[PDB]
């Protein structure tokens, strides 16, 4: 059917430490990249991280050559719409990635005001993003396929500014 042995992920999603821990769940989690169950590999990126898992399928991510969790690229980091446009990947890339890719989700009780968890709340009790921007309006195939990619649109537009 669909089996795997090791996750093809990026160094940003792998965690900011040489030693990590993986958890393999064979044939589960319903990977929507190929509509087939894959080995869901959960891990911990570090202290105060998101502790996410694998989302895309194994064979479905081999043709795209992107991360298992971030699903951007393999070496540069641009989206698939920006990678298929064009070196163009040398200038659009950026080393030392931000912690927002490994940051946890927001607290819905903090947005509602009744954050009864307190200082032991694992979620981030900060302000959410602006919904007027297209950066918080992506989808499943919108990030995987190059069609309707808002992150790739601003990457080619801001590349010619000065």
């Amino acid at each position: 059917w669909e089996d795997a042995d090791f996750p093809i992920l990026c160094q940003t999603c792998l965690g900011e430490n040489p030693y990590i821990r993986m958890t393999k769940e064979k044939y589960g989690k319903e990977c929507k990249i190929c509509a087939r169950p894959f080995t869901v590999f959960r891990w911990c990126p570090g202290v105060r991280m998101r502790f996410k898992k694998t989302e895309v399928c194994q064979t479905c991510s081999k043709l795209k050559n992107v991360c298992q969790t971030c699903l951007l690229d393999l070496e540069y980091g641009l989206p698939i719409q920006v990678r298929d446009a064009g070196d163009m990947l040398l200038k659009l890339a950026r080393t030392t990635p931000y912690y927002k890719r490994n940051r946890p989700h927001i607290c819905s009780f903090w947005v509602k005001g009744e954050c009864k968890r307190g200082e032991e709340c694992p979620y981030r009790h900060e302000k959410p993003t602006d919904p007027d921007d297209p950066l918080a309006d992506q989808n499943i195939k919108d990030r995987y396929y190059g069609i309707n990619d808002p992150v790739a649109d601003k990457l080619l537009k801001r590349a010619s500014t000065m």
Binding site: D5, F6, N17, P18, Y19, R21
Partner: peptide
């Protein structure tokens, strides 16, 4: 390229976290 090791998981997780 995968390359496993036969080291202990207890001493490796204790040394990296320290």
């Amino acid at each position: 390229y995968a390359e496993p090791a036969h080291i202990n998981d207890f001493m490796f997780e204790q040394q990296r976290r320290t």
